[PDB]
């Protein structure tokens, strides 16, 4: 239609800027990264946003609300993703044997 | 901290079906997920392989967790060579 073609345009053309993530990663490493790191790390974070919004619209469709996304559907989105191990936290030393 | 992903993330939520005008407190949440996702995939990436940040260990975490992050990183590494072959 005429909205699906506009939505497909924003699904492909949108990206995080490489001039800021290379500034953001290098503040964590200390020295330097490469261009093929920033190209991949800018691409995984678009999949991760698409992992949340496609699942936060499943929270909103499950409850009785409309397309505008309140934060109620966004804290619930991170809760359901973390229970399936999708959201990694490297500060919680987990233990499976008890 | 200011918001470094305020205008970029509004295009992306529209790209996955949200609205043309998302709420400010919803982009407040998604901007903090991405900064933690890049932090909790760099803090764990500087212990694997070596104490640097080569991209041969960024591709390790994407398998056995979610195959969409792996099938969309093999496309960005293949298309880097088909966009330098055209020049």
């Amino acid at each position: 239609s005429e909205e699906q073609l506009n939505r497909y345009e924003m699904y492909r053309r949108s990206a995080f800027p490489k001039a800021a993530i290379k500034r953001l990663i290098q503040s964590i490493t200390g020295t330097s990264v490469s261009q093929n790191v920033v190209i991949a790390m800018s691409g995984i974070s678009k999949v991760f946003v698409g992992e949340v919004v496609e699942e936060a619209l499943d929270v909103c469709e499950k409850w009785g609300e409309m397309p505008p996304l309140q934060p109620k559907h966004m804290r619930e989105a991170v809760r359901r993703l973390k229970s399936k191990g999708q959201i990694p936290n490297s500060k919680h030393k987990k233990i499976i044997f008890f | 901290r200011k918001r470094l992903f305020s205008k970029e993330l509004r295009c992306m939520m529209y790209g996955f079906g949200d609205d043309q005008n998302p709420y400010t407190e919803s982009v407040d949440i998604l901007e903090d997920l991405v900064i933690e996702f890049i932090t909790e995939m760099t803090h764990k990436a500087m212990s694997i392989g070596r104490q640097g940040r080569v991209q041969v260990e960024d591709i390790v975490f994407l398998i056995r967790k979610d195959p969409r992050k792996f099938a969309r990183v093999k496309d960005l590494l293949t298309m880097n060579e088909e966009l330098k072959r055209a020049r």
Binding site: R13, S14, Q70 | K7, C11, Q20, N21, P22, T24
Partner: peptide
């Protein structure tokens, strides 16, 4: 020179269509 000016035109239309009014929520 063609790659330098056309890169910012994919993002310039990404500030005219999406996000016209800024909302909030209780």
């Amino acid at each position: 020179v063609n790659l330098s000016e056309e890169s910012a035109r994919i993002l310039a239309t990404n500030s005219e269509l999406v996000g016209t009014l800024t909302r909030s929520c209780k």
